[PDB]
Amino acid sequence: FVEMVDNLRGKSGQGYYVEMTVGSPPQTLNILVDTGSSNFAVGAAPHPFLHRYYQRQLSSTYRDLRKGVYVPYTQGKWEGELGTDLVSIPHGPNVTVRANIAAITESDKFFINGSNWEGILGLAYAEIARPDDSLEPFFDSLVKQTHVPNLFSLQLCGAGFPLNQSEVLASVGGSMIIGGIDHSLYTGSLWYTPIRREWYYEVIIVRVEINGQDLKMDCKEYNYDKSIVDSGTTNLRLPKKVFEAAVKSIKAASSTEKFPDGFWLGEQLVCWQAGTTPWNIFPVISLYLMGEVTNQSFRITILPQQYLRPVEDVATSQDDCYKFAISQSSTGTVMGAVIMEGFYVVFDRARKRIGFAVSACHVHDEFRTAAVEGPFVTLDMEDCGYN
Amino acid sequence: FVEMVDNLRGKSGQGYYVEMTVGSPPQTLNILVDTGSSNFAVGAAPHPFLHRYYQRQLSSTYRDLRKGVYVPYTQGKWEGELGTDLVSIPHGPNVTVRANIAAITESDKFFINGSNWEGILGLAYAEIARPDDSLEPFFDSLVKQTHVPNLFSLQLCGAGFPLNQSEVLASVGGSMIIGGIDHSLYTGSLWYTPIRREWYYEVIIVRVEINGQDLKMDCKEYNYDKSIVDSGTTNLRLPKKVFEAAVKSIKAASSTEKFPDGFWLGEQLVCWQAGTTPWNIFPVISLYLMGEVTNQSFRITILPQQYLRPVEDVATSQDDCYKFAISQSSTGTVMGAVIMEGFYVVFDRARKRIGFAVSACHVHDEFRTAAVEGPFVTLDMEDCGYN
Ligand SMILES: CCCCN(CCCC)C(=O)n1cc(C(=O)N[C@@H](Cc2ccccc2)[C@H](O)CNCc2cccc(OC)c2)c2ccccc21
Numbered sequence: 001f002v003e004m005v006d007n008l009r010g011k012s013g014q015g016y017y018v019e020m021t022v023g024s025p026p027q028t029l030n031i032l033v034d035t036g037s038s039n040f041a042v043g044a045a046p047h048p049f050l051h052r053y054y055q056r057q058l059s060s061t062y063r064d065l066r067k068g069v070y071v072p073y074t075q076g077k078w079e080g081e082l083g084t085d086l087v088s089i090p091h092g093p094n095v096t097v098r099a100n101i102a103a104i105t106e107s108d109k110f111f112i113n114g115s116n117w118e119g120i121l122g123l124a125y126a127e128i129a130r131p132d133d134s135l136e137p138f139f140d141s142l143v144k145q146t147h148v149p150n151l152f153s154l155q156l157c158g159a160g161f162p163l164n165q166s167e168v169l170a171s172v173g174g175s176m177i178i179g180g181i182d183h184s185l186y187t188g189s190l191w192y193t194p195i196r197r198e199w200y201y202e203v204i205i206v207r208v209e210i211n212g213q214d215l216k217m218d219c220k221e222y223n224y225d226k227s228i229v230d231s232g233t234t235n236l237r238l239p240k241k242v243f244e245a246a247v248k249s250i251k252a253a254s255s256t257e258k259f260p261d262g263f264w265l266g267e268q269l270v271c272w273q274a275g276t277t278p279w280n281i282f283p284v285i286s287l288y289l290m291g292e293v294t295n296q297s298f299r300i301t302i303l304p305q306q307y308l309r310p311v312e313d314v315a316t317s318q319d320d321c322y323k324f325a326i327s328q329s330s331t332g333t334v335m336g337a338v339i340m341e342g343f344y345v346v347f348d349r350a351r352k353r354i355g356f357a358v359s360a361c362h363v364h365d366e367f368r369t370a371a372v373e374g375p376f377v378t379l380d381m382e383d384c385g386y387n
Numbered sequence: 388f389v390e391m392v393d394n395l396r397g398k399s400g401q402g403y404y405v406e407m408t409v410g411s412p413p414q415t416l417n418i419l420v421d422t423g424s425s426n427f428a429v430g431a432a433p434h435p436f437l438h439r440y441y442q443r444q445l446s447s448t449y450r451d452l453r454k455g456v457y458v459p460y461t462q463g464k465w466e467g468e469l470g471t472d473l474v475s476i477p478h479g480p481n482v483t484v485r486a487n488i489a490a491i492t493e494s495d496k497f498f499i500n501g502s503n504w505e506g507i508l509g510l511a512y513a514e515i516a517r518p519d520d521s522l523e524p525f526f527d528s529l530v531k532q533t534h535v536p537n538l539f540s541l542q543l544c545g546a547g548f549p550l551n552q553s554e555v556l557a558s559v560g561g562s563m564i565i566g567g568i569d570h571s572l573y574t575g576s577l578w579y580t581p582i583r584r585e586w587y588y589e590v591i592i593v594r595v596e597i598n599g600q601d602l603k604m605d606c607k608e609y610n611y612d613k614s615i616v617d618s619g620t621t622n623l624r625l626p627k628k629v630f631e632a633a634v635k636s637i638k639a640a641s642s643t644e645k646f647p648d649g650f651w652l653g654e655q656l657v658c659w660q661a662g663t664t665p666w667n668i669f670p671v672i673s674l675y676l677m678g679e680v681t682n683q684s685f686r687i688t689i690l691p692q693q694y695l696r697p698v699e700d701v702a703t704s705q706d707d708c709y710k711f712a713i714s715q716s717s718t719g720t721v722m723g724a725v726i727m728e729g730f731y732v733v734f735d736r737a738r739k740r741i742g743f744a745v746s747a748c749h750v751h752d753e754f755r756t757a758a759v760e761g762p763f764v765t766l767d768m769e770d771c772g773y774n
């Protein structure tokens with residue numbers, strides 16, 4: 001799938017996007033890849049943060065569905081006007097699809113200045129599409145209309161350091177492989193966890209460790225009220241009780257150096273003299289995921305190089321600065337971009353499962369690496385899902 | 388080397404021993420395998436803790452050297468009379484060696500009640516032999532007088548639970564392979580560290596981690612005043628300053644449970660309800676060793692299953708009990724039997740190097756194993772050796 005390798009750009013703090021064309025003649029637009037939603041939507045009117053937008057009047061193939069749409073996310077919201085049009089992915093499969101598009105006319109805290117994207121590709125299922133599940137999501141339209149296999153995979157590549165505006169524009173941010181799996185994008189074995197339900201890409205976490213030490217909570221707490229894989233969110237997000245336990249444990253493991261509460265709240269930077277970030281004092285985090293095989297599970301292990309998010313030192317120093325990229329959630333677990341950056345993630349819709357492998361572009365040091373390991377057969381399991 | 392596999396019995400707390408015969412006709416004795424000394428010595432007079440001893444007057448091949456010898460160890464001492472005799476290892480190479488033998492006539496806190504051994508095989512070099520370096524150690528005599536390659540390897544197998552008298556006699560304690568390497572005794576790769584100087588089996592430790600966290604001391608402190616591989620000592624022994632830093636870090640990592648001072652002093656047991664030992668709260672310990680290749684190193688990693696030594700309860704019960712098998716040293720680092728139990732150790736005298744690989748018989752759990760891993764290149768390791 002060489003043609004699709006390196007087709008993504010961006011970073012965890014602002015999102016990863018793919019180039020698309022909409023309309024006739026083709027209007028080129030950069031589109032955020034979002035596994036956490038199901039609407040395909042584009043800026044359709046001038047906006048301070050957009051350098052371009054969808055011009056419906058200029059497309060001969062535009063079809064007006066004569067219907068409004070409102071989409072509130074956990075963060076940000078927009079409203080628009082529904083329609084269909086011809087859509088392609090220049091560095092995806094050689095196909096053109098007629099797909100639903102929400103033309104965004106109003107928005108609040110949705111578009112991000114300097115992110116270089118103008119729309120969003122919701123890759124999850126119809127169940128969570130707005131206004132309702134009759135609005136067929138882009139990926140469903142793609143599979144139905146073409147011969148593309150019903151799956152995709154994502155390699156999100158974090159740099160491990162801050163990238164400026166021109167650097168983000170000039171670098172490869174990863175790969176979206178539409179209709180397949182590329183073996184150059186990972187190392188070792190691909191382990192699969194079942195998609196619990198086809199709405200979000202929902203999964204079940206059966207155990208959590210901090211440096212090998214069991215959080216020791218009822219596994220239901222890890223999936224309260226769901227656990228999702230979500231490329232349109234920066235952080236790992238955890239239910240209140242899990243978050244407090246994880247933070248307490250991470251503070252304890254890294255207790256040789258003390259940090260502001262603002263840091264653990266994910267808002268304040270911590271900085272170290274150039275090169276001196278003490279990675280070794282911060283623990284690894286293992287999330288155990290339900291296996292395909294009964295009574296079986298595997299684990300994914302992430303480093304502080306994943307959960308400490310590199311940010312710019314704007315001061316007159318050469319310091320290396322980071323934000324704590326774990327946050328509290330009131331809507332269940334969210335495995336956001338900083339986690340996905342550790343792994344090659346296969347969204348095997350056909351077989352209703354999600355694959356994880358160590359990413360060929362994950363950030364690490366010579367002492368530790370991210371890992372995907374199994375099987376584990378002694379885990380108290382079965383009822384870890386929430387109802 | 389099928390004939391030599393499973394030729395050891397014993398336990399870390401009392402020592403691992405091999406069967407030998409001395410004299411003509413052969414007198415069968417059990418002999419402690421000791422990489423930490425260089426004198427071959429046997430009980431040669433009645434002692435409360437010996438069920439058998441060397442009777443020189445019944446050996447037609449006995450030669451009396453008319454010279455006394457006194458050997459003080461870190462713990463225990465003995466005095467005896469020097470001579471030579473024919474020696475064999477029934478479950479070793481098919482050879483007969485004429486070797487020096489100290490006939491022990493007086494001892495103090497050396498022989499161990501219920502250990503089932505009656506002498507000691509010092510496997511280290513002449514430099515540390517008593518009365519002096521002209522008393523050729525057994526292994527040297529073996530190599531000189533036979534075609535046996537100048538190499539031996541040890542797999543010490545800890546049970547992971549306590550062994551009563553009956554069990555330890557009926558249980559296999561591991562393997563001493565004389566003249567080679569058995570590939571069935573380890574998994575993964577064998578990694579080699581240089582023998583710094585042929586006296587003890589002296590090595591150089593460049594870095595110490597507790598759960599991936601650097602102890603952060605100058606590497607000289609790890610090797611003050613030497614670091615040795617020593618099967619004739621139960622515990623990992625550490626220089627005062629390293630021991631204090633290690634214990635503080637082990638305490639911190641395991642702080643969810645609190646233990647008496649006497650536990651950390653290695654003096655008193657801690658007990659848990661049967662099967663509930665919380666392995667996961669205790670950290671792993673990695674020791675990085677100097678590689679053969681310049682500015683390159685590797686690491687060996689042990690579990691609490693190695694550094695917590697299983698012991699019988701003082702008030703017999705079904706509880707699982709352990710002592711902390713790490714002690715303070717004033718004579719440098721000692722990699723004792725509890726460390727060696729994690730690994731297949733190759734004493735490659737011919738190439739002046741020691742090989743480590745994960746032991747096929749090491750105690751672990753479903754979540755963690757002992758490891759031998761490398762290479763590592765970012766480590767500053769210049770004056771790590773002490774002079
Ligand atoms: C790409 C990373 C950019 C950084 N960013 C935005 C800026 C924050 C200052 C950020 O990290 N966050 C992005 C969040 C978020 O809500 N993202 C949604 C998509 C999106 C992408 C880009 C911008 C806005 C939104 C996603 O679809 C929700 N999935 C579950 C869901 C929930 C409800 C309805 C629904 O369906 C209609 C699906 C978010 C949440 C909490 C904290 C930080 C968050």
Ligand SMILES: CCCCN(CCCC)C(=O)n1cc(C(=O)N[C@@H](Cc2ccccc2)[C@H](O)CNCc2cccc(OC)c2)c2ccccc21
Pocket residue numbers: 399400401402403419421423424425458459460461462463496497498515517617618619620621622
């Ligand atoms: C299998 C161990 C059973 C338990 N045991 C004994 C009972 C403790 C109360 C125990 O753990 N310890 C055994 C120690 C020890 O000194 N062992 C020597 C051999 C031996 C085997 C069996 C019995 C006694 C002795 C070894 O040769 C020293 N090497 C360096 C060295 C030093 C000096 C001279 C020298 O050469 C002339 C070599 C020891 C030391 C400190 C703590 C615990 C120790």
